[PDB]
């Protein structure tokens, strides 16, 4: 069936840019849709960063657009989140999820990856 996988560098020597990789196998990548980045803190609360379609539409937080880059890789059409600075203490989980447009139907979800802001 349609499968997705998320990975990333996670942690290397400091003062670097995380490039978290999200891709989907078994299904077409760039037909319609919403692709959301999701951030969760061990305090059990969620929040939103941004969405990208195939329509080309993009939407991000006004206060968080500073150091977030959504980049393309065409060999399989996987999308990369570039963000500055990775550490260990600020252990938070990140998800990439394709979903029905309008933030309405969360069709798929991410598995979660360790990303830190500290």
């Amino acid at each position: 069936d349609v499968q997705l996988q998320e990975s990333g560098p996670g942690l290397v020597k400091p003062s670097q840019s995380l490039s978290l990789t999200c891709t989907v196998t078994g299904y077409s990548i760039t037909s319609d849709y919403a692709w959301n980045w999701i951030r969760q803190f061990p305090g059990n609360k969620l929040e939103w960063m941004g969405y990208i379609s195939y329509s080309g539409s993009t939407g991000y937080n006004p206060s968080l657009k500073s150091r977030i880059s959504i980049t393309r890789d065409t060999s399989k059409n996987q999308f990369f989140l570039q963000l500055n600075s990775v550490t260990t203490e600020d252990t938070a989980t990140y998800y990439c999820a394709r979903l029905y447009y309008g933030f309405y139907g969360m069709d798929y979800w991410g598995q979660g990856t360790s990303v830190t802001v500290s």
């Binding site: 059990n44 609360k45 939103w48 309405y104 969360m106 979660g112």
Partner: protein, 110 residues
């Protein structure tokens, strides 16, 4: 402009209805439609969408889960209740920006 879930640790037994109150400050109801989603999670576990629109059946789970209310208030009704329902449940609006997290209430078993 705060969004909450009531209560964090409620009394849940077997067979009756369980009432989770998703209080959203904004006026959710758009053109006669209130964009609600309820989903389950575990710490470190990939979330899965439990129910959508609060009144349309989701493929895989019977009518035990439903949602009522309008505008400022909404209610996840678990009728009846089972034991494995212990999870972090999240209510999410879908009308427009801002995408605002719900209370994410954790279901405890007595």
């Amino acid at each position: 402009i705060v969004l909450t879930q009531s209560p964090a640790s409620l009394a849940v037994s077997l067979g009756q209805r369980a009432t989770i109150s998703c209080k959203a400050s904004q006026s959710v109801d758009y053109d006669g439609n209130s964009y609600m989603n309820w989903y389950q999670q575990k710490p470190g576990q990939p979330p899965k969408l439990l129910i959508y629109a609060a009144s349309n059946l989701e493929s895989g789970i019977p009518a035990r889960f439903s949602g009522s209310g309008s505008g400022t208030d909404f209610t996840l009704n678990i009728h009846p209740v089972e034991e494995e329902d212990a999870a972090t449940y999240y209510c999410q609006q879908g009308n427009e920006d801002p995408p605002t997290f719900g209370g994410g209430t954790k279901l405890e078993i007595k």
